Amino acid sequence: DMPVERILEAELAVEPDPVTNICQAADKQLFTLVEWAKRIPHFSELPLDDQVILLRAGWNELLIASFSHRSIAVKDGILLATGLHVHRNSAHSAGVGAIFDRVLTELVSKMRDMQMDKTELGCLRAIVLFNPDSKGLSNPAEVEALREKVYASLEAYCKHKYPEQPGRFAKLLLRLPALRSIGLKCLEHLFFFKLIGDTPIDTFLMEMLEAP
Template identity: 70%
Template sequence: MKREAVQEERQKAKDKNNEDQVESSTSVNSDMPLEKILNAQLAVEPVNDTYIDAPDNAIQNICQAADHQLVSLVDWAKRIPHFIDLNLKDQVALLKSSWNELLIINFCHRSVAVEEGLLLSTGLHIHRSSAHQAGVGVVFDRVLTELVAKMRHMKMDKTELGCLRTIILFNPDAKGLRDARKIESLREKVYGNLEEYCKQKYPKEPGRFAMLLLRLPTLRSIGLKCIEHLFFLKLIGDTPIDNFLIEILDYNQHCHGKS
């Protein structure tokens, strides 16, 4: 089952881009450099590593953290190679398709440092008991056991985190894309980049790349559950997320002279 899940993740990007498979690892790395992916991740991470226990309102605290992180999420995406070269509608479509998963995986990786809870970007630590009191204990426990615990066990590093987030971002199945083929090609380059990185950085862990990819279906499932449980209901006041993303991206492009 696990092998099938890994193959499915990669096959989605391969089916329509078989011609890209002849590229060498050098070509992939030069076009989608790990350094830029890592730097993008580091640039938007909270500077303060300290945290405090949050009040009991778990859902409100998570929503506030999501609100705060949506702005930095756009900043992160703009730093990912080739993202700002896409047309504005595709940028919005990609972020709209992936924002909840991108926020969750960040929360989870940050939470590796704590026990029995989530460490939010705002510095608040939400204990699982608070989540259970708020009625979201089931999905909260899934986050802890299927994502945080797995990341902690394999000691997922920030380069791997950045690559997984980039794979999530470049979703060729996002609704409303004008150039899905281009997105597929970009995602496949990240796959190749990450696989090569795992081989070189962790030569004694031949299954590491597969273990990383196995987090993606789990993350997708949990992301849907989080939406169902209204984890991210209160986002930017009454502003629809589409409009919010367009405003941020459009403003940024004007500031940088892009049409």
Template identity: 80%
Template sequence: TSCANEDMPVEKILEAEQAVEPKTETYIETNLGVPSNSPNDPVTNICQAADKQLFTLVEWAKRIPHFSELPLDDQVILLRAGWNELLIASFSHRSITIKDGILLATGLHVHRNSAHSAGVGAIFDRVLTE
């Protein structure tokens, strides 16, 4: 077990996260939770946030020990296979302090009611409960 920890130290994973993901406080202080250039359409907002988060996910993966040493095809296969779980884990972690909502990568806070109004309430509720 200690050998595995030496090969993949938690500190390196944390460093990768901190290098690509601003603190939650930064989102709130900068945007008060709502970016000024944000469209009013919740689906557009969610898609823009997903796009930003996917870009960030690739940057994060490149910083994970040994990932960049893999052949490029293997890197792509791994990211394609796990992007959805990593995306959900990312905004779930970012939203720990948010009640009945999630904090997207763009800094937008999406409340449960807004998600239901946009037609993505069932998915939203599943994410909040899992």
């Protein structure tokens, strides 16, 4: 009904050429994803092979959710975990303005235009993490159960805090479709970079693109 502060705890523990910088910030946080998920109620009690499968599945959406929320503070830019700011002016000149602008309007803006609080960002991340449809899962039913628990606990949280908005929870969940979509597109750009010879051979991101 409410392991919520454990989830916020997880989020606070992990965290502080334009493409090259974004990818290096990504490498940095991809690693912390291990410590982040381990601090998530019940995640550690799942078979090792399942924990790895869940992270290989949502790692990109998970990282995009995090830096997007961190960026609510600025405008027309994003704040990397390496302490750098990247302006959309730079995204465009480098060739990625389209997906960049999609991140700014469908994620950064929607979270700033409703004041998303870290505890909700942490919960959406946990819902993204507990995707029972991931291929290869030992017990997809237990994972599904865990997702449901984040749903319950999260809705329960929106009530205790924002009762004068008998909908908020539904508004939070509206970010999921965009994240899923933006996330798939980023994997494409990543493949693309390797396709055209400007592959970032110095990160671990490209290993995450391999087929399971």
